[PDB]
Structure 1
């Protein structure tokens, strides 16, 4: 039975509004309703992995798992295995996988982050799950960010706290946050970004939604505008939105948006908004294709509608050779030529690099680079031809061309990372000098760039 080179992944996010679900929720897992929906001809085909994020979830873990498993069994006639479940307050993540994957999944991690301080600590934050699927690392984040139209900056701060402090994936990747630890990272939830239009325009917005004319609303969506301005979710993707705003509905229908200020809302307006979102970030040149992104129309117990997204994702096999794992494969090497880091720092410490990759026995430290002053007042750190030659554990091009090198540039004075990025080994040529490039981030904000050339030698 061959190992897969692709899987499909279902991502669901639903703010349940503290109400139990209705008896039938299958439309969620079938990607049926509004937006980019799944073809009816696929309804019996199970996804490989289902990741369910809830917010304001009133159920016990046992109660929700029974509903989820019975839903999937009805759709697919498959009894899914529980990979992980983790709950912080009323924020929950469930991961389910086809039984045939049970011995493909390992290194399961869970964690949570509580956002805010004093007043604002006690219900917002994030839960996450990571694991290895054969040779591929997968991370999943469900976050419930700060509410309210005038708190976009708070949401952005919540985002940065979550990516800094959520401890998932390989703890040996010490310089790297969750935005660099996984082949594929999915981040979803009630992100709570709003359509920024004046309150007086509520009925006009409702009109536009009834006409299915979303363009003049999406152009004011705070998540799209903050992402365009590089304030949040730098280097993440989101599918185009083609479904109506998923908040705030009157319960038990979808005919009415409930936007007016009430004592129950803290006298705040809740103009119709795309609160409920799915974004992803995959390593460079890894296959990932969104095959659905939409909302259900028939699940009406909450003031939010459920959101679904599905993906094709590239995966690799747990490779063994005569040599690696447990030795190098002398026939393989990775060389870096003419490399330099450009950093936004004012600091004047010397810097060194760390190269991390599961194609190495352990990470590799470089010599210090040569600092030069750049023409527009930046720091340029030159490595020239001084970088260590990296010795992969396996030389087979079928393995090595699918790998990635994580790079951290660290201060010699403090050993703190000033920037992290990732280089794909999926090159146009071997034994050939080729340009490489990554942006560098720290705490998920842009701090610089790394560029140079690579020369990859495989056994072929």
Structure 2
């Protein structure tokens, strides 16, 4: 039975509006409704992994697991195994996988983050799951961010608290937050970003939705505009939105958007918005292809419609050689040549690098770089040809070219990371000096760049 080099992943997000679901929710898992939808000819083909995020979920874990498993069994005739379930208040994440994957999945983590202080602590935050699928790390975040059209900045703050404080993946990757810990990271939920148009334009917006003319609405979507201005979700992807706004509907129909201000809304308007979203971030040059992104039309218990997204995701096998794991493979090496970091910091400390990768027995600390001034104000940290030669555990190019090197640049004075990035070993050539580049971030915000050349030796 061969190990896969691709799997498909279903991501669902649904704000259930504190109501039980209807008796049939299969359209959700089949990616049927509006937007980029899945071909009828695939309906019986199970996804490898289903990740369900709910918000305002009134069900017990048991109640929801029974509905989910019975739904998937009805669609696929497969009895899925529960990988993980984690709930914070009424925010929940469930991960189900095909039974054949049970001994491919390991290192299962769960965590949550509560966002806000005093007033603003008590119902918003995130839950997450991570695990290994053979040689591939997968992370999943379901977040319910702050509501309200005039709180986009609070949403952006919620995002930065969640990526700082959600403790998933390999705790040895200590300089790295979740945005660097996984081959593939999926972040979804009721992100609560709104279409920022005047209240008076509510009926105009509704008209546009009935005409399926989303362009003038998406140009005002706060998540798209905040992302374009690098305020949030830096280096994440989202598939083009081709489905109607998923909020705020009258319940038991989808024929009416309920946007007017009410006591129940705190006298806020809820103009039709794409609150419910799926984004991802994968390591450079790993296969990830969105194959569906849309909303259901027939699930009407909530004032939100469910959103689905499906992905092809590249995966690698758990590699064993005669040598590694448990020793180095003298036939392999990674050399970083003529490298320099460009940092936005005003601080004058010395800096050193750390190289972290599951292709190394443990992380490698460099010597300090040489600080110079850039022509436009910047700190440039030069490493020359002084960087430690990295000794991978396996030299086989079928393994090594699929790996990645995480880089942290740290202050000698404080040992704190000023920037984190990732370099793919999927090179155009081995034994050849080739340009490398990564942006550097810290707390998910841009702090600089790392660039130079790499020379990779494999056993071929």
User: 1:36-71: CA deviations, max 9, x gaps?
Assistant: 000000000000000000000000000000000000
- Residue 138 of structure 1: CA displacement? 0.1
User: 1:268-310: CA deviations, max 9, x gaps?
Assistant: 0000000000000000000000000000000000000000000
- Residue 411 of structure 1: CA displacement? 0.1
Instruction: Name the structure 2 match of 1:403.
Output: 403
Aligned counterparts of 2:179 and 2:94: Cα–Cα separation in 1: 21
Query: What is the DSSP-based 3-state SS (H/G/I as helix, E as strand, rest coil) of the residue aligned with 1:132?
Result: strand
- Residue 209 of structure 1: CA displacement? 0.1
User: 1:379-421: CA deviations, max 9, x gaps?
Assistant: 0000000000000000000000000000000000000000000
Aligned counterparts of 1:347 and 1:398: Cα–Cα separation in 2: 42
Instruction: Name the structure 2 match of 1:292.
Output: 292
Query: What is the DSSP-based 3-state SS (H/G/I as helix, E as strand, rest coil) of the residue aligned with 1:382?
Result: strand
- Residue 344 of structure 1: CA displacement? 0.1
- Residue 254 of structure 1: CA displacement? 0.1
Instruction: Name the structure 1 match of 2:439.
Output: 439
- Residue 231 of structure 1: CA displacement? 0.1
Aligned counterparts of 2:128 and 2:266: Cα–Cα separation in 1: 30
Aligned counterparts of 1:38 and 1:117: Cα–Cα separation in 2: 42
- Residue 370 of structure 1: CA displacement? 0.0
User: 1:124-152: CA deviations, max 9, x gaps?
Assistant: 00000000000000000000000000000
Aligned counterparts of 1:129 and 1:21: Cα–Cα separation in 2: 23
Aligned counterparts of 2:2 and 2:167: Cα–Cα separation in 1: 33
Query: What is the DSSP-based 3-state SS (H/G/I as helix, E as strand, rest coil) of the residue aligned with 1:175?
Result: coil
User: 1:142-197: CA deviations, max 9, x gaps?
Assistant: 00000000000000000000000000000000000000000000000000000000
Instruction: Name the structure 1 match of 2:48.
Output: 48
Instruction: Name the structure 1 match of 2:362.
Output: 362
- Residue 259 of structure 1: CA displacement? 0.1
Aligned counterparts of 1:262 and 1:390: Cα–Cα separation in 2: 62
User: 1:68-107: CA deviations, max 9, x gaps?
Assistant: 0000000000000000000000000000000000000000
Aligned counterparts of 1:213 and 1:298: Cα–Cα separation in 2: 21
Query: What is the DSSP-based 3-state SS (H/G/I as helix, E as strand, rest coil) of the residue aligned with 1:361?
Result: coil
TM-score normalised over the length of structure 1 = 1.00
Aligned counterparts of 2:238 and 2:50: Cα–Cα separation in 1: 18
- Residue 424 of structure 1: CA displacement? 0.1
Aligned counterparts of 1:384 and 1:245: Cα–Cα separation in 2: 52
Query: What is the DSSP-based 3-state SS (H/G/I as helix, E as strand, rest coil) of the residue aligned with 2:349?
Result: coil
- Residue 361 of structure 1: CA displacement? 0.1
- Residue 433 of structure 1: CA displacement? 0.1
Aligned counterparts of 1:267 and 1:349: Cα–Cα separation in 2: 51
Query: What is the DSSP-based 3-state SS (H/G/I as helix, E as strand, rest coil) of the residue aligned with 1:414?
Result: coil
User: 1:215-260: CA deviations, max 9, x gaps?
Assistant: 0000000000000000000000000000000000000000000000
Aligned counterparts of 1:329 and 1:390: Cα–Cα separation in 2: 11
1:204 aligns with 2:187: no
Aligned counterparts of 1:294 and 1:73: Cα–Cα separation in 2: 22
Aligned counterparts of 1:166 and 1:420: Cα–Cα separation in 2: 17
Instruction: Name the structure 2 match of 1:316.
Output: 316
Aligned counterparts of 2:405 and 2:273: Cα–Cα separation in 1: 39
Aligned counterparts of 1:452 and 1:263: Cα–Cα separation in 2: 59
TM-score normalised over the length of structure 2 = 1.00
Aligned counterparts of 1:187 and 1:66: Cα–Cα separation in 2: 24
Aligned counterparts of 2:235 and 2:34: Cα–Cα separation in 1: 27
Number of matched pairs: 460
Aligned counterparts of 2:438 and 2:96: Cα–Cα separation in 1: 34
In structure 2, runs of 5+ residues without a counterpart are: none
- Residue 319 of structure 1: CA displacement? 0.1
After TM superposition, which residue ranges in structure 1, 4 or more long, deviate above 3 angstroms? none
- Residue 447 of structure 1: CA displacement? 0.0
